[PDB]
Design a protein around this ligand. Structure first.
Ligand SMILES: Cn1cnc2c1c(=O)n(CCCn1c(=O)c3c(ncn3C)n(C)c1=O)c(=O)n2C
Ligand SMILES: Cn1cnc2c1c(=O)n(CCCn1c(=O)c3c(ncn3C)n(C)c1=O)c(=O)n2C
Ligand SMILES: [Co+2]
Length: 573
């Protein structure tokens, strides 16, 4: 019933996030892992944010050379699922910077239909389990903010038809998901990211129709206070503090959930949000709004500047303020950076707002103020979820969590899992794969002299590359490459004592002789259309194949990741 959902930005892997590779995600603590994000143009074609990150980076895996088709985050997500079958993996489309083309795509049925088709192919080739639509937001006119993000599309083509068209798009997605799930024998899910505030909901979100279609919906109950306002507040508070002024009324988890429910949202489908980062203001004066919470709801002075010189009350960020690359002063520090934050903003004292169940940091002399989630407030959100029969918690984002006793970033993720689920292992799911089109031939080679015999074996990858566009052709290529092939041969009364180039080495494992092509640089990625032809040595000469029972192959993403997709490619009759 419950979910623990996590966003992983593709830019986690670069220096700005400390080079955080998916193998250090605590996948056994999550039910759902969202790849953030895939883009798409006005014609419904998928578009990578960063091709290398998605399909090529080695991600710290020994024996992956940059660009090898088994590289990239999307393949690493498959490995996380194999190593942690509690996990479902999924793709988030859109986000704040890549929602610019939803309006046009949703308005036109033929384009909606092409977009859906492209998404279905994408999750087929990546073996993903769900689609997450992050249209942020329908009905909401927004211009790109190129100071914050040179790559921001905004939502400049927003209109009042978005609300209705969004439902059509979700209907088309869920129908296609239904159909492809039955074809592949798997269960797909559809989720969406939703806004916290009434005003955006009224413009873009037909609540009761939406919750009738989706499997669950993630409410973005964070970024609810920030440097865009000159009043300090909680950005991700569980409860509305009674002393909150008009701008922050309704802008808490509890109030947003109550609003969605009142509009027909089913409780079990509602997932609430936790922020793994701060927002904050440079100089907040205590107006005494709540003497029990000094500096909360106080007045922030407009004393700093954005990287385009716009005056702002926002505090400095963890990352340097660069025009087009985090250009707005927003007091944004990762949760794993709270000690860095305290070293830069000295004199911060830690306060707990027991009415909001939210922490904040405030220096009452300088005025500096930061709002965030900690272990305690995550536990309170989980308590609330359990008690209101809600659907779980979602976090933004994985790379900002702190480490504890290993290289995994897992302090808050482990707090969230354990408060939602207890200490027990998460439920595990079956993982299915589509068998590849692999054939083979086995021919005795007559030995007239010497000791032993020989079997000449051929294995052919008959896959064929079909797809167009960068995104679908790269993920198709990866899916249609046979990776680290192991050949399992069962015999009746005959030993395979050796193999010759270009085979990999032979070993005996239980009843099987095993040829390991992952151990051969030339053997470990077998491209669509390639044949491997090679000799096997036998302890006795043969004239037929009656002594061979069966030949199977399995794959691995990396030499040291789990075997998957074991399939029979030859059998004796
Ligand atoms: C705090 N937060 C909470 N919800 C969020 C965010 C957030 O920052 N972004 C905006 C994130 C933009 N972005 C980047 O900044 C980014 C990037 N690739 C490299 N960078 C450097 N991508 C793919 C991306 O989308 C979101 O889209 N959402 C939903
Ligand atoms: C001026 N203003 C007044 N009230 C506001 C805002 C505002 O900008 N944001 C937005 C804060 C989160 N956020 C962003 O930071 C953001 C964004 N798109 C690009 N950016 C960089 N979106 C879609 C978004 O939601 C709000 O959440 N509220 C309540
Ligand atoms: Co309803």
């Amino acid at each position: 019933k419950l979910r623990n959902v996590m966003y992983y930005g593709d830019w986690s892997i670069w220096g700005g996030q400390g080079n955080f590779y998916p193998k250090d995600i605590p996948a056994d603590k999550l039910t759902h892992l969202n790849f953030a994000f895939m883009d798409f143009n006005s014609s419904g074609e998928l578009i990578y944010c960063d091709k290398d990150a998605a399909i090529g980076h080695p991600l710290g895996n020994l024996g992956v050379t940059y660009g090898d088709v088994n590289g990239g985050i999307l393949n690493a997500f498959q490995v996380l699922k194999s190593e942690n079958p509690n996990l479902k993996i999924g793709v988030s489309l859109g986000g704040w910077s890549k929602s610019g083309d939803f309006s046009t795509i949703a308005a036109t049925p033929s384009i909606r239909a092409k977009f859906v088709e492209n998404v279905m192919k994408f999750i087929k080739y990546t073996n993903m389990d769900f689609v997450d639509i992050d249209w942020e937001y329908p009905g909401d006119y927004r211009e790109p903010d190129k100071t914050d993000n040179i790559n921001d599309e905004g939502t400049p083509n927003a209109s009042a038809g978005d609300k209705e068209n969004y439902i059509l798009l979700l209907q088309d997605l869920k129908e296609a998901l239904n159909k492809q799930g039955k074809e592949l024998g798997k269960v797909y899910e559809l989720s969406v990211a939703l806004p916290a505030g009434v005003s955006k909901i009224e413009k873009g979100i037909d609540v009761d129709k939406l919750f009738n279609i989706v499997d669950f919906a993630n409410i973005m109950t964070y970024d609810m206070a920030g440097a865009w306002s000159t009043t300090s507040g909680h950005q991700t508070a569980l409860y509305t503090n009674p002393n909150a002024p008009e701008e922050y009324k309704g802008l808490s988890v509890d109030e947003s959930v109550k609003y969605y429910i009142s509009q027909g949202a089913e409780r079990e489908k509602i997932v609430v949000g936790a922020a793994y980062y701060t927002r904050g203001w440079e100089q907040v004066s205590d107006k005494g709004t709540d003497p029990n919470n000094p500096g909360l709801f106080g007045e922030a002075a407009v004393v700093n500047k954005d990287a385009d010189l716009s005056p702002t009350p926002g505090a400095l960020n963890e990352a340097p303020m660069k025009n087009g690359e985090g250009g707005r002063a927003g007091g944004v520090w990762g949760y794993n950076a709270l000690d860095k934050l305290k070293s830069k903003y000295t004199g911060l004292k830690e306060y707990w707002d027991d009415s909001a169940k939210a922490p904040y940091l405030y220096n009452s002399e300088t005025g500096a103020f930061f709002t965030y989630d900690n272990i305690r407030s995550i536990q309170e959100k989980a308590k609330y979820v359990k008690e209101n029969n809600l659907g779980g918690i979602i976090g933004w984002m994985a790379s900002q969590d702190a480490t504890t006793n290993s290289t995994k970033r897992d302090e808050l993720t482990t707090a969230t899992k354990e408060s939602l689920f207890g200490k027990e292992d998460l439920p595990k799911y079956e993982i299915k794969y589509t068998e590849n089109d692999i054939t083979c031939t086995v021919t005795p080679v007559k030995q007239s002299w010497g000791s032993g015999g020989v079997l000449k074996m051929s294995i052919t990858n008959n896959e064929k590359l079909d797809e167009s566009g960068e995104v679908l052709s790269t993920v198709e290529t990866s899916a249609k490459t046979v990776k680290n092939m192991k050949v399992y041969i069962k015999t009746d009364g005959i030993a395979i004592t050796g193999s010759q180039y270009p085979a990999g080495p032979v070993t005996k494992e239980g009843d099987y002789y095993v040829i390991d092509f992952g151990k051969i640089s030339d053997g470990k990625l077998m491209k669509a259309g390639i044949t491997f032809t090679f000799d096997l040595n036998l302890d006795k000469a043969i004239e037929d194949t009656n002594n061979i029972i069966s030949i199977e192959v399995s794959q691995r993403m990396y030499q040291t990741s789990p075997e998957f997709n074991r399939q029979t490619i030859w059998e004796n009759t």
